[PDB]
Each structure stands twice: as structure tokens, then as C-alpha cells.
Amino acid sequence: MDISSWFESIHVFLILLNGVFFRLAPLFFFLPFLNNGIISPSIRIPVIFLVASGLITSGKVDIGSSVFEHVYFLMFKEIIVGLLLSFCLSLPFWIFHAVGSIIDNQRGATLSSSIDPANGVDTSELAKFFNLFSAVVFLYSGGMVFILESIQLSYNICPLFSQCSFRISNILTFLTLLASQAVILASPVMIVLLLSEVLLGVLSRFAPQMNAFSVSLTIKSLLAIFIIFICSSTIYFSKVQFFLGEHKFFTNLFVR
Amino acid sequence: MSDIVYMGNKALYLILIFSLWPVGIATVIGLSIGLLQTVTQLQEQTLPFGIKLIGVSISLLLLSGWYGEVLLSFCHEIMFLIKSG
């Protein structure tokens, strides 16, 4: 009876769904809008599986010929590719979080934890605000379509049932790329606050018996927030620049 | 133009406005007390902190109603935007 064939087809479909979920979960981790602190575990998994089902039924998933016998190599390849994809897609949020954190450190609110790594202020608020701002701007500028297209490209480059080789020398530059972008973006605030505290130091040099630390903290806070406000015109296009850069970057990671 | 960016700039603008007066009073007091200490050679840091505390407390006490009114207006605007998001 054809019911047996139906059961076989459904179970094969479920296996493929499990594979796509294997690839998608790291992406669902390194993403600060569907972060696992705002979506319940009883809603996250069905959404992930529905996305996987839509992707596979749309015919945008590439499958080879089941070349590698042992499934463990396939599993670890899928895990590492998922981690690489998540890192590629989390770069704008991470770099803006870093910008916020270093600006907060410049202000001095988290300097207590900078001195003592045990206590103080180890949680930043301006950094979280910047992270949310960048996340929502990316999301409403076409983020979901770009993420899905990146997933499709990842499937295209390294298909599910094949072995692919990576560029180590090209994936070892992620950390320096992140740091460079953060320092580039936060350069105005950094230089303004540094010059302000240098000038206050000169004032203290010409004013011997005076406490300059509290005044420095106050002026740093005010100047930092003013500069951030007047700098809210150089943030939008960076999202599109990150679109192009991350797309070509993730393209140039495998032995294509 | 990009309602999200508009709201972010509005929030930063409100931040600057709210934090202007107390921060300014604190830094003016600190500089004045430091100059006085330099002139009369006392070398004591407790007086500027105490007077700063008094001034900041008084200013924050005085500005509470206006702070609340502006924040409530902003929240009502946010709710209005939510109604037709």
C-alpha cells in the first residue's frame, strides 16, 4: 500500500529538516533579535523548524550524493559551517556593541570594573542601546531577506552531503576586522574625550591644588553624549556597507 | 525619514536636555571650588563633593515635574506610533 511510501517520504523529509536545523541553530544563537533571552524555548524550536521546512520546500537547499561514509565528519562540517555563518552575520551587531562598550569605558561608568575585574560595573547600558539600535535598523532595512539569501549562498557553496575545505588564513582575520571596524567607528568620540582630558590635565597643571578626576568624569560624560547625538547621521549607510562586505567576505572563506 | 532613526535621535536629544543642567551645575561647582582651593591653599576634596551633592540634589528635586511631563509626552508619542506601526 502507498501508505508505506508516504511514511518513508515523510521520515526522509524529517531527516532533512533535522539537518537544516543542525545548520540553523548557531545562526539562531549569534543573532541579537531572536536571542535566547527574549524568545521562549517553546516558541524558538517550532519557528526554527518551520523556517527549515520553508527553505527546503522552496528548493533552495543543495544536496550532493552522500559522498562521505561516516556521518560524524558531515555533522562536524555542518556545525563548523554554521558557526562561520553566524560569525559572518553577527559582525555589525558585535561591532556596534563594541563601539558602545568602549565609549562607555571612555566615559568612566564601567571604569570600576576595568580596575577590578571582580566588582564594579561590568554591564554597559549605552552599549546595549547601540546594539538594539543597530539590530532594529538592520532588521527593518531588509535584514531577514539578506539573512535568508546568505543561508542560500552557504548551502550553494558547501552542499549538505559533501565535504568542503576552508581558508584558515581568511577566517583568522575576523577578530582584527572586528577591532578595526570598532576603532574606526568610535574614533570621533575617542579623540574628543582624549583631547578633553588632556586639556583638563593642562588646567590642573596650572591649578595645582584641585581635584581633576571628578571634573574630568563629568565633562567626559557630557561631551561623549553630545558627540554621540551630533554623530547620529553616519550610522545608516554602514549597514549597507556591512551587507556588501560580509557577503563578499563569507564568499571568500571556502575553496570555491 | 526612517522613523526608527528619528526616535533614536529624539531619545538622545532628550538625554542631552535632561542631563544638561545637573551636569553643568556639578562641573561649575567643582571648577569654582578647585580655583578657590588653589587660591587659598587648603588642599581638601570633601568640600567640593559636599557642595556638589547639595546642588545636584536641589536641582533634581526642582526639575522632577518637568522631567516627568516630558517623559510622559514621549511615552505617549511612542504608544501612538505603536498604534499604527
Binding site: 547625538f229 551630533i230 547621521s233 | 525619514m1 535621535n9
Partner: peptide, 17 residues
């Protein structure tokens, strides 16, 4: 809308144009 000023929000710029 004076040109030599502060931030000059985008509505002012579009009005100038």
C-alpha cells in the same frame, strides 16, 4: 534656516533643497 549652524536636522536640509 541659517547655513552656519548646528546639526541642522534632515528636514531643514530638504527644506533648503
Amino acid at each position: 534656516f541659517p547655513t552656519d549652524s548646528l546639526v541642522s536636522s534632515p528636514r531643514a536640509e530638504k527644506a533648503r533643497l
